Design a protein around this ligand. Structure first.
Ligand SMILES: O=C(CO)[C@@H](O)[C@H](O)[C@H](O)COP(=O)(O)O
Ligand SMILES: O=C(CO)[C@@H](O)[C@H](O)[C@H](O)COP(=O)(O)O
Ligand SMILES: [Zn+2]
Ligand SMILES: [Zn+2]
Lengths: 188, 188
């Protein structure tokens, strides 16, 4: 019988690094067509192209019942008024749920159905978020320090980026008049 | 179609409490036939019947792709020389994996396959443990404060307590001459 070996790994809740994980870097230039203010995007890319977020992922083969986990370090920033966020995605197998545990910083999650019905959940250290089957999810950094969290997801969930890539979320998170606001996407 | 509502909840990393969750308590009286020293067990039940652990569970219906999560507060203690532990279980759907995130205290996990081969993984705050498909899993508190962790598991995993209830784990975790030891279970 083939059994896989249990393992433990240290996650630094201060940095989000998992040593030995598959590390992914997303710079702002990897995020064309994601932010409402297209000229601000282009300008911040030309002037800096900052890292928006980094992922440390521990992934299994795509098998039903098995589980992947990953930390994300989402860096502080705005493109125009719109706070830095993850690209966001549905799962390829839509009915797969997810669990997030917020570890550090201040942020939130934007979630939406295949119909564009939308929800915002605040996240501070210790907030666990239940992402139900069929909800697209995007995390947002609303602070001045990195927003770091752990996600645990079905190993066979997969990723569906395309739909969010072209249409976006139906709601957006901005800093307007010194205040964090979740408002309608004026482009959806 | 019908979509369940996303929610966040605060987990308290000092106490392991999740408000609104399904609370479960195990006292030593709930653990007959688990510990090597049955007379110690009997005396301690008759004297104090202490809490061994508390569970705070957020559970979905048993459906493929969906996820549950729960914290456990494993109290410090010994039955004779043997550190306080959880009952331990395989999943009813045997191939369902599990992810644990250690939050407070000091301990570890005993894992074993249906064959009976056992692994011990140390857990400190920040340790994430991957429990693979087919591994029974028990957590052990080897410290002097609650050992506190969050478990994320497939909603359809279920629990299979029976085999572990009857025969235990092939390894025990004991304190002997001021030293934590993982040794073969004499009753195996
Ligand atoms: O949803 C899970 C599983 O993949 C997360 O670990 C995100 O993948 C990560 O926060 C980066 O964001 P995306 O670019 O994947 O939206
Ligand atoms: O493995 C997961 C799934 O439920 C944990 O939440 C344990 O259920 C908990 O630590 C109590 O341990 P048991 O009494 O179920 O072995
Ligand atoms: Zn996901
Ligand atoms: Zn389990």
């Amino acid at each position: 019988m083939m059994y896989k070996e249990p393992f433990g790994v240290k996650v630094d809740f201060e940095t989000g690094i998992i040593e030995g994980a598959k590390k992914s870097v997303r710079r702002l230039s990897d995020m064309e067509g994601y932010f409402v203010d297209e000229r601000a995007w282009k300008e911040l890319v030309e002037k800096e192209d900052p890292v928006v977020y980094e992922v440390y992922a521990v992934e299994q083969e795509e098998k039903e019942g098995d589980l992947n986990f990953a930390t994300t370090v989402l860096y502080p920033g705005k493109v125009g008024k719109e706070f830095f966020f993850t690209k966001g995605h549905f799962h390829a197998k839509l009915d797969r749920a997810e669990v997030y545990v917020a570890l550090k910083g201040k942020g939130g999650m934007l979630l939406q159905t295949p119909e564009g019905d939308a929800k915002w959940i605040s996240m501070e250290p210790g907030t666990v978020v239940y992402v139900p089957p069929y909800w697209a999810h995007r995390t947002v950094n609303i602070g001045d320090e990195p927003f770091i969290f752990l996600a645990i997801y079905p190993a066979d969930a997969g990723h569906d980026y395309g739909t969010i890539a072209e249409k976006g979320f139906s709601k957006i998170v901005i800093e307007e008049n010194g205040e964090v606001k979740v408002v309608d996407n004026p482009r959806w």
